[PDB]
Amino acid sequence: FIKEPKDQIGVSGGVASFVCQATGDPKPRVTWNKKGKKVNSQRFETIEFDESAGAVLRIQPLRTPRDENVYECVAQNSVGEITVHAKLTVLREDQLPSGFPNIDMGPQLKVVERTRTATMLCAASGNPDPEITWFKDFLPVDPSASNGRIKQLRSGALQIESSEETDQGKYECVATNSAGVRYSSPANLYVRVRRVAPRFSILPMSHEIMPGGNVNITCVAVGSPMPYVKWMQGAEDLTPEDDMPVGRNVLELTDVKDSANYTCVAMSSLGVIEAVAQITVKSLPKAPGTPMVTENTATSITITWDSGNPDPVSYYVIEYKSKSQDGPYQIKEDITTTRYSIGGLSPNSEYEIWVSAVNSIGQGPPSESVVTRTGEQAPASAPRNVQARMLSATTMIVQWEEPVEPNGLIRGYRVYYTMEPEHPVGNWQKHNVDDSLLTTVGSLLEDETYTVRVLAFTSVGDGPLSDPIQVKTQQGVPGQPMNLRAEARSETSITLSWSPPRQESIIKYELLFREGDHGREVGRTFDPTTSYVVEDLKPNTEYAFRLAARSPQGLGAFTPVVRQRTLG
Ligand SMILES: *[C@@H]1O[C@H](CO)[C@@H](O)[C@H](O)[C@H]1NC(C)=O
Ligand SMILES: *[C@@H]1O[C@H](CO)[C@@H](O)[C@H](O)[C@H]1NC(C)=O
């Protein structure tokens, strides 16, 4: 017997619970007997607990002298049988000592929600002060067995720290002392279970991160029952069920590279709901979208272009090339506007232009291109291989090749000529020509030497004059030699060279030269070639040469003075 029933002194019309528990091996089946055999009655009642191991005897309302007996608690297993006894005395109210316990305030009908605490009141008085006991659904309550959740207070009440459905019942408080026992009126405690389907306190939050790249997705969900929180990627779960948290569940992702979605799954017996946060890995930009030309100049193009991107963009990169002379690509980095002027171009050329955008991940693809042409300019160069001969004794035919650097559609040429070249060229005789590469002029004085110089022009303006060619109006004699070049062969030698003559049959060439400015004029005649090597000269000194051709009719015009020096 781990509990033994005490003798009780009770009140008429009151209650009297006798407690009797046993133990051992085998486990017993207890009983309650009066005078040997269990002569049962209406007002008496047994409430067996722990599978008939211990059992309370309850009597109510108490009557005197009917109920005043010694009662036997039987206890037996396969091996052993021992009784224990207890007496009941039952007094009327009018014959109670002054000190007999009295319930000043018993418990009240109480309602409370699960896990929240419940303080069941009981206040008594007597001499000596009575120790309080509680019965719930006719069974005594033991604060020890509750894990310190339930506890009796000196002041009187019984405290339930965390409510549970099981804590519901009729409650009776009982004031016990040397005089005897007194019960309170019963009072129910209800423990209501509010049914609330789940919702999210904090939703799972979408993010944009860099590649690797790490983010904690928090997800909080509340309700009643308080819902479990796990993570899913599509159809598969990620959090396990060994220690799956409730209410909260953070997902710490690390080293992310692919943009993936994630579902938080709030779940309980009442219902399931879900919310999806999408992690996105910031990507490269998109093509800025075809640029457009605003201005042009001889040397510049300037353009504007749409961002082409929903997110902002660190800067832009222009790439371009001359379509005219394919290649190479030119770059302009670190452009921080949607407007740019590409300068340092060459006039009258057309360029294909693209645009790319850069963000913190890198540089995106390029736009579609825009082809466009730079404006015109005056030519940077003169007509080439300018030539002249006589058709008659008084008219001259001149021709030339168009200049390598026209900077524009060539609108014509202009031809300056005279036989007093020491004047400025602007004073010379001059007239215009069309884009053709050849003209004539007459009204020339017979047996003379005219010098001729030619320039090209465009809508914009004049180019440079060619270098002076000159022609003698005597006919039959050959023309002035072409592009006479002189270059140093050795420390005592110079190699003269010139372009092959046109049609005219030259008998011999006539060469004249001298040392520096003030040296003796040497003369040499030789058979027709395009080059001649001058031998036996002085080291590191300068010589001046000029050349003319001879035909049967006579001596042609001389070149201008060409100068070159021997090695040194
Ligand atoms: C995520 O949680 C981990 C662990 O508490 C912490 O070390 C880390 O700093 C957190 N990162 C972010 C971005 O919240
Ligand atoms: C995730 O789902 C959203 C729903 O709008 C969709 O827009 C997005 O493209 C999806 N992303 C992935 C990685 O499946």
Residue numbers in the entry: 35 to 602
The paper states:
We reveal that the multi-domain extracellular region of RPTPσ is unexpectedly flexible. We determined the 3.15 Å crystal structure of a six N-terminal domain human RPTPσ construct (termed Ig1-FN3), which contains all the binding sites for synaptic ligands identified to date. This construct maintains the V-shaped Ig1–2 arrangement previously reported, followed by an extended conformation of the sequential domains Ig3, FN1 and FN2. While FN1 and FN2 domains align approximately with the long axis of the molecule, the C-terminal FN3 domain folds back, suggesting the FN2-3 linker may also be a flexion point. Since no substantial Ig3-FN1, FN1–FN2 or FN2–FN3 inter-domain interfaces are apparent, we hypothesized that when released from crystal packing constraints each of the Ig2-FN3 region linkers may provide substantial flexibility. To test this, single-particle negative-stain electron microscopy (EM) class averages of human RPTPσ Ig1-FN3 were calculated. These showed a broad range of conformations. To control for the potential risk of artefacts associated with negative staining, we also performed small-angle X-ray scattering (SAXS) measurements, at a physiological pH (7.4), for both human RPTPσ Ig1-FN3 and sEcto. This analysis further supports the observation that both proteins are flexible and are likely to adopt multiple conformations in solution. Taken together, crystallographic, EM and SAXS analyses demonstrate that the ectodomain of RPTPσ is able to explore a large conformational space.
At the axonal surface, type IIa receptor protein tyrosine phosphatases (RPTPs) (type IIa RPTPs, for example, RPTPσ, RPTPδ and leukocyte common antigen-related (LAR) in vertebrates, dLAR in Drosophila), are a recently identified nexus for extracellular interactions, receiving signals and transmitting them intracellularly to the cytoskeleton to regulate neuronal extension and guidance, as well as synaptic organization. There are two major neuronal RPTPσ isoforms, sharing a common intracellular catalytic region and an extracellular region predicted to contain three immunoglobulin (Ig)-like domains followed by either five or nine fibronectin (FN) type III domains, in the central and peripheral nervous systems, respectively. Previous mutagenesis and structural studies have demonstrated that the proteoglycan-binding site lies on Ig1 of RPTPσ, and comprises an extended positively charged surface of basic residues101314. Binding of postsynaptic TrkC, is reported to require the N-terminal three Ig domains of RPTPσ17; the NGL-3-binding site has been mapped to the FN1-2 domains.
